[PDB]
Amino acid sequence: NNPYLFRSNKFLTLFKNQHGSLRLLQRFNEDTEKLENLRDYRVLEYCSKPNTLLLPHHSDSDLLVLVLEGQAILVLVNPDGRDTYKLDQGDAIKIQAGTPFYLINPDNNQNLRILKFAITFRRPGTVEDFFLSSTKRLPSYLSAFSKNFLEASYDSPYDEIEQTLLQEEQEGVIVKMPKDDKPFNLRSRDPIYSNNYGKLYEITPEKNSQLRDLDILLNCLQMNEGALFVPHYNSRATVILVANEGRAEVELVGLQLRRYAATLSEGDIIVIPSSFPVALKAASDLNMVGIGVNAENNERNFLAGHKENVIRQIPRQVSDLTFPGSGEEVEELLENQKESYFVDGQ
Amino acid sequence: NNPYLFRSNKFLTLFKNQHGSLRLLQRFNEDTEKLENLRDYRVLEYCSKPNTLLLPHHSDSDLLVLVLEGQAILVLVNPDGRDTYKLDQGDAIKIQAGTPFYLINPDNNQNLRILKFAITFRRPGTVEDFFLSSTKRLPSYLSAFSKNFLEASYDSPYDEIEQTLLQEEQEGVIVKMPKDDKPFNLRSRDPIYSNNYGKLYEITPEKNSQLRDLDILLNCLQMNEGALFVPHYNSRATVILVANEGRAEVELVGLQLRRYAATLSEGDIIVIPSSFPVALKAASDLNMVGIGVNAENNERNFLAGHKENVIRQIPRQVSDLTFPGSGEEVEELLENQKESYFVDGQ
């Protein structure tokens, strides 16, 4: 029915216990041919309660992690040392494939909600995580090496090894903290569109190094109840829109001619293909996050509103031949709307 | 039978009316595995009678347009203004995805014949065009937005909108002109091969910016009745050869060993895979256009003729062991032909 809509019920549970959970969105091109260009990306969601730890592991994919709610302490381990980063809501950072890391929710009363965008390359569309410790689910990967191999490697009898490293200590991979380059924020720059109905912050590869290698753009959208983000479309970027807070009424048009409309609730996701005109209304105060792939050189073209409206650049004789009304009639209509980008949805 | 030949009857009609037409070549890998490397490209042809207009629309693909015959006025619309370019025969220009544009045939007695090479990325192998105006075939895309959405966007009652913008004015997307970076030419530089039998002009990514991002080379070939373009092959570039004027006898060799030969008439197309030796004879005076994909660093290696013949660089003892005749016998034979590139097909 509507191939660009991914409701939260379409995420799959990798792990869940009383301290948090890890879910993975179904493959973008799982049951549609329309999203072939997104086959190398996977979206994950990590949520954990206070004073919890996600145990050390490395992923086989490059990850872009965004703190959607809360605060976290992220530790990146290298062969020669380690890097510790304190993440705030709205903070983003790229964890390269193969870097072991663990995450901590240090807050005493706030939950951690993190969005992980995965860019796969080893096996297109597949993300694997290698955890160092054994648990109910799965034994430590170190455990699959032969005794001989292990004994020689560490230079200790198998005994010391299976007791100090391989034995199952914890139950899951999210555990309770024993009861005793750099990240960037999506709001570190003025918004690009900002008025009394809405605000849009956006970081593009041309301005940020970590995004430059991924060819990804990131954006933070906030709108007031009843406001409307007017019909527009992206020239190059296909955008994965994530509903963070609030409810949104989204209308997407694509090519015979189809209208895909839906109301997104927190957790829901809608993918906006490059070139498709789209518009959305804040059915309530809302915040959304957007990840745009194929981002280099994207341009947003507006179809309504005063500023950046392409329809307003079409000359009169052309517009006369283009639309029903006369040149003067169309040019006036396009003037009625005084506001740009975000308008009143009343 | 012959997988690299696309006869004009294999183009498909998108739109046609008394003022012109738009056709799209079938997918290169439609019924052959052999052209997987061309799956992201589509070739289109636009032809229109005098004093006609192709209505404003944006495409979801990057387009390379070539004026094959006539003259045109192309207008590129941006959110802040517009650019107008007057195109002559042999003129080429790249229209980036998402840029709305319209085309005019200003001539009073000459037809417009334009070749559009499409480089897809949103949905590999698919080109979509979004037209602003409604017509018999399809309503304006603006029309698929809800009234509410439209009313708020423009700030006008739905009434003014459906009359000034969405109502069906024109019948098709090619209409009669009311009865009242920059483009480059394929001949802007001396030809690379030029003698009394033929001439070859060629623009490569290493010399032109717009071609640099597409990794495409373009070439214009003209030969005299009876002349022969001697056996040679391209090291990296796979070339789509388009028969513009005249008739051509083409012989293509590929690997068990196969000879694909055919006579191309105006409109016909033959694809020359990198490495395959190829040769062709002008059954009459002729002009052809070539679009080479995977162009960076292409090298043409000649198998006959005096200049740039690889066979003439093989040393004598090797050639002796390589061919039947003696070293001296082969080296002489290779001398018989005094001319290079283009020779006499008598």
Place this chain on the structure above:
Amino acid sequence: NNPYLFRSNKFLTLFKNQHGSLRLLQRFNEDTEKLENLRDYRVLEYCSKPNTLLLPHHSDSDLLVLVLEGQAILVLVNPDGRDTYKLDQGDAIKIQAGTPFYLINPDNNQNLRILKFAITFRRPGTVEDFFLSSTKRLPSYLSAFSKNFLEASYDSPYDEIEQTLLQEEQEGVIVKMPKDDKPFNLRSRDPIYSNNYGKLYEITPEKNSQLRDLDILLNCLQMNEGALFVPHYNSRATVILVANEGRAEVELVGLQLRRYAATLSEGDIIVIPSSFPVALKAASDLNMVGIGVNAENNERNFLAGHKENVIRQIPRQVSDLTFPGSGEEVEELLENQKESYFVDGQ
């Protein structure tokens, strides 16, 4: 059963005669979904007896050739001249697609063993070779051109042509020498890991131009009977490991959790996916060659041994929560092994 193991019996014979042979490894993703990232590469092996010649031909693929044993004289022919390179064991060179070339084994008592890594782009996963001379198997490609075409091209009656060029002289493409940028070596730099149990030499794209365009890393591994290359994994590079001399016991771990182990004999090949931990023991003195694809920025992370061990960078409280033993117990165990990279397999 074990999808990453390619035993020498899986190579296929292209050509074989009393003077040598040419074999081609089956497609990496032939019967496994797991190696999609390797579908564009093919591995070939060329072996020839003394004073032999492999006849001139061009390939439609870029080739990386490595001299595994012996010495060779390689001649690269261009349209304007020729380049001759003398290759020694351990020498590597890239032959671009479309460059005709021939190879000679000048030694009087030593065989030539060359590994050819093919990077395809015309038809992903397919390598074609165009030989200039006709033989039992296949006629010269020049022979598929029409007489007319040939006569005009060379300017000689068909007679002189079919006798001097097209007639079948030799029997195969490897013949006996009539009884009368630049290549680089894998050891041109100090090894990166070097002790009394093993040595590892490695050339990465960041340090070598020819490798830079292929995004390939190359490495030469030599280990003493009984030594062990400790558990470690590659962050980005998927590595094709080729068993040159000796026997190796390899243990590879991948993700439910699987242990793929095997002993490699000379000629055998094992593919190590990025991120999978791997370890191997020299069942006898041994030399192996590795070709790593997706090489840019690869990092090797060690799981045992003193130097570059990631497990040793995990802080104590974390390790306590991560592993069974206490922080102190794990940190000590990880100290038992005094040596790094290569240890004793006794």
